[PDB]
């Protein structure tokens, strides 16, 4: 199966949880200590994978993956709309070769998808979507 | 309500035609004199809009669009994968404010979506997908 993956390279522990775009029940609340990795098989409806520094999911960054009419593409989004605990760190999000990455340098807020500057990238299926926190 | 639009600001007559993703009939083969504009209502299934300097649509540029719900995004691609008659001129493709656009300078070949580097963007609905040739 296609994978949504979040690598925690931060010193700090993070919490990751995937909220399907169809609005159904989420995946398990996942604790990632330094060096640990979250992964899940792609949810059929797409999902927003929230990443927070608290168990209560305060002000999470999210990694979104979704699909469209055009059956050829998957779409991914690295968003600071609701917050970003890693704003002073590097965060990368990649669908693999042949498509655009997010490679967001420390303190480069304008690299992320923003409420009034949305950044959602498309890429031919199949894809894995792989992020590193504190790259 | 949403429209896919092609403004021909070039000195040349151009030809535009839409090819629905769901296989329904092609749109009218549209001749745009220098200065004229093509437009169509958003097709539910999405579409490929070919843009060429010949009526036979040989080696055309294309504008691709589609849209989804949950998330409610519209997707748009400015592609030179099949050719680009307007490579020596400026071409823009914008969904309106608040989202990543294409603004492809004259002879900036890498600005377009390419076979080995796809460039497809998403934006919250509703949008008009609006291209200007020789901007």
Residue numbers in the entry:
A (entry chain B), B (entry chain A): 18 to 152
Please give the exact wording used by the authors of the publication that reports this structure.
Magnaporthe oryzae, a fungal pathogen of rice blast, is the most devastating rice pathogen and causes a destructive decrease in rice production in epidemic years. MoHrip2, a novel elicitor isolated from M. oryzae, is an exocrine protein.
In this study, we solved the crystal structure of MoHrip2 by X-ray crystallography using the single-wavelength anomalous dispersion (SAD) method. There were two identical protein molecules in an asymmetric unit, and only one monomer is shown. The short helix was located between the β9 and β10 sheet. On the basis of the crystal structure, MoHrip2 showed a high similarity to the three-dimensional structure of a large family of proteins containing a thaumatin-like domain despite the low homology of their primary sequences. Of these proteins, we were interested in xylanase inhibitor TL-XI, to which MoHrip2 was most similar in three-dimensional structure. The 14 amino acid residues located in the middle region form the functional region responsible for the HR and the disease-resistance induction of the MoHrip2 elicitor. These 14 residues include a β-strand within a β-barrel and part of two neighboring loops. During the process of HR induction when interacting with its target, MoHrip2 might undergo local conformational changes around this stretch, especially in the loop regions, to expose active residues necessary for function.
